[PDB]
């Protein structure tokens, strides 16, 4: 056989997390699964900026750090758009036809990453400066 068989390979405690993440989940549309990825990634990306920044004892350290976090999401919105134009040139088909194999819904993924990304950046801004 081609693939190696370790005793920890093909374990359902690990494979079960894969099939229920918003990248392999069966019921999600590309607008929904990009909204869930962005809401998780934007929530922790404002983590390192507000306590490790050029200004941390300021008015001021939480607002400007959260401004840098949405700055990364709108950068990674461009990279998700740039990866979409390159890897899906006419939405090149393949054998499996997922969202990631052939694109076919990819513009909804990049938009859903931007709403959930910039929202959860702003949502975690509410939980640090207030609440």
């Amino acid at each position: 056989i081609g693939h190696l068989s370790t005793p920890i390979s093909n374990s359902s405690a690990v494979n079960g997390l894969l099939a229920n993440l918003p990248a392999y989940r069966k019921g999600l549309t590309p607008r929904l699964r990009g909204l869930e990825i962005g809401m998780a990634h934007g929530y922790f990306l404002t983590g390192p900026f507000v306590e490790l920044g050029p200004l941390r004892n300021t008015d001021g350290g939480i607002l400007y750090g959260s401004l840098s976090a949405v700055g990364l999401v709108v950068i990674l919105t461009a990279c998700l758009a740039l990866y979409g134009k390159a890897n899906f040139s006419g939405s090149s088909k393949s054998k499996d036809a997922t969202l990631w194999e052939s694109g076919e819904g990819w513009s909804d993924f990049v938009s859903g990453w931007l709403i959930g990304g910039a929202g959860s950046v702003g949502f975690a801004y509410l939980l640090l400066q207030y609440i």
Partner: peptide
């Protein structure tokens, strides 16, 4: 004053545009 506006444009914004323009140009095909 105009230094404060222009040096993040050609330092950050304009390289982000031309890298975006060159990357799609590389991976296009006929």
């Amino acid at each position: 004053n105009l230094p404060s506006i222009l040096v993040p444009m050609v330092g950050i914004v304009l390289p982000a545009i031309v890298m975006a323009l060159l990357f799609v140009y590389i991976e296009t095909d006929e």
